[PDB]
Nucleic acid binder design. Structure first.
Lengths: 59, 59
RNA sequence: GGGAUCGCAGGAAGCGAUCCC
RNA sequence: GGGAUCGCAGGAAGCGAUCCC
């Protein structure tokens, strides 16, 4: 694991094609944004489980 | 931007080599963890801006 | 043990400080 | 207008609901 600490309205980076943002919080919930090409997949765990179901390399 | 909402302790996914986790908050600041191979780089914008400065490779 | 709130930084679910129960 | 607290959900700095002043 690699950890970082920021404030609402700031960003973080991954690779050379992705960026991440903390749009804010809503109590103990957290609003998070992602900025990547359609060249990559980005989803919450609940959608991600359909991608690992047999198609992590779509048509 | 692609956006998702979570709570402290939940997680998010990217590609087939990265995962993200909201470890919790510390006021209006937030603390996040990342889970990727050394085959890719991850940093906050303040470090990332030295990498894109004209090198994209350490010493 | 948990919350609020601020700061310093890596491959570590990091590290420090303030406030409240 | 602000705070607390939660649900749904997508390529959008998205959407909804509960509680308090």
């Amino acid at each position: 694991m690699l950890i970082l600490t920021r404030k609402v309205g700031e960003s973080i980076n991954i690779g050379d094609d992705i960026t991440i943002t903390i749009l804010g919080v809503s109590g103990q919930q957290v609003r998070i944004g992602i900025n990547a090409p359609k060249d990559v997949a980005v989803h919450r765990e609940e959608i991600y489980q359909r991608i690992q179901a047999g198609l992590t390399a779509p048509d």
